[PDB]
Amino acid sequence: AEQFAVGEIITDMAAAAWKVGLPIGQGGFGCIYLADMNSSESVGSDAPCVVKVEPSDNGPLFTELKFYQRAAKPEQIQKWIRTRKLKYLGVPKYWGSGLHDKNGKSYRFMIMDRFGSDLQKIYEANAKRFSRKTVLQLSLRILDILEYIHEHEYVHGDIKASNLLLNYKNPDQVYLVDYGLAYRYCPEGVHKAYAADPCHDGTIEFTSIDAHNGVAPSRRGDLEILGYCMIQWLTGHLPWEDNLKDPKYVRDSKIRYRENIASLMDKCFPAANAPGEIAKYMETVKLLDYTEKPLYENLRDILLQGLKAIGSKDDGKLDL
Ligand SMILES: C#CCN1C(=O)[C@@H](C)N(CC2CC2)c2nc(Nc3cc(F)c(O)c(F)c3)ncc21
């Protein structure tokens, strides 16, 4: 159903003017439309923005909007890129938000960057494998994103290929989306206690042991989720993938494989052929306490030794 008239001009809270175009991806992702700056020209298929629209009473869009307003300000992101000497940062840029009435109902809208394909479509097109080169290059950039959001008091809790999108104009740049169930683990620098939060489940195959135990996600959980993603991307499989309707089984399997990472490597890889950097990554994440700040540069260094081992380097090429 129609939130906007096609081609309509909408003004955000900061009085910036935008034009609304057609819904994205045959309406497969819900109420998300192409958007551009207000101009005499119609919004084309090459629009640089999207507008997401939900009823004002939608909890997830409010959570997401708050994350975006607090940590995705364009200048704020650019400053981080400059000061950390990054090529880019995969955190979508926030362009504005407002309230829009239609048919006597109140809607919230948010203007964000427009990306290309999600990684899950590309993964499936590649018979559910990424090369070691691709996985190490993806994971280095996701460690940059996680360090960023963690340093801005948030954890994502749901890293996966469907939440990773390529830059529309650059296929070597990957961005992490979906902050609707993101968790502010450290409001004003005070870490949440090890307990439930009045609900961040995550995706069952990739979620953290912390999440399965019913506690609020923290930084170690995000790094654990990326670990499971890396194995899924390399091998096409996870050991517990046939028992995804039994959370108890999934949690039990993850707990057992955390206690014995050698047995996880033996299970997931051909005998005697497991990538050492994946094992070292999981061993390092296992050592994190619930409230502990990760050493993100140590984790990047572990993955860089992986690139050295295959005769490569971090040249920012995702090889997709
Ligand atoms: C056209 C086109 C391509 N395209 C898709 O095919 C699918 C994968 N999606 C939807 C995303 C959710 C999976 C897209 N999302 C966005 N922007 C965007 C979405 C967000 F959710 C968000 O928070 C944000 F900051 C920006 N641009 C383009 C697409």
Swiss-Prot record:
Effect of mutating T83A: Does not abolish autophosphorylation
Enzymatic reactions: L-seryl-[protein] + ATP = O-phospho-L-seryl-[protein] + ADP + H(+); L-threonyl-[protein] + ATP = O-phospho-L-threonyl-[protein] + ADP + H(+)
GO molecular function: ATP binding; histone binding; histone H2AX kinase activity; histone H3S10 kinase activity; histone H3T3 kinase activity; kinase activity; nucleosomal DNA binding; protein kinase activity
Phenotype upon changing S131A: Does not abolish autophosphorylation
Compartments where located: Nucleus; Cytoplasm; Nucleus, Cajal body
The record's account of how the chain is modified after translation: Autophosphorylated at various serine and threonine residues. Autophosphorylation does not impair its ability to phosphorylate p53/TP53. Phosphorylation by PLK3 leads to induction of Golgi fragmentation during mitosis.
Subunit structure: Interacts with HDAC1, KAT2B, SETDB1, KDM3A and KDM4A. Associates with the nucleosome through interactions with nucleosome DNA, histone H2A and histone H2B; the interaction with H2A and H2B is mediated by the nucleosome acidic patch, a cluster of negatively charged residues of H2A and H2B forming a cleft within the nucleosome core.
Disease the record associates with this protein: Pontocerebellar hypoplasia 1A: A form of pontocerebellar hypoplasia, a disorder characterized by structural defects of the pons and cerebellum, evident upon brain imaging. PCH1A is an autosomal recessive form characterized by an abnormally small cerebellum and brainstem, central and peripheral motor dysfunction from birth, gliosis and spinal cord anterior horn cells degeneration resembling infantile spinal muscular atrophy. Additional features include muscle hypotonia, congenital contractures and respiratory insufficiency that is evident at birth.
Protein name: Serine/threonine-protein kinase VRK1
Organism (species): Homo sapiens (Human)
Gene: VRK1
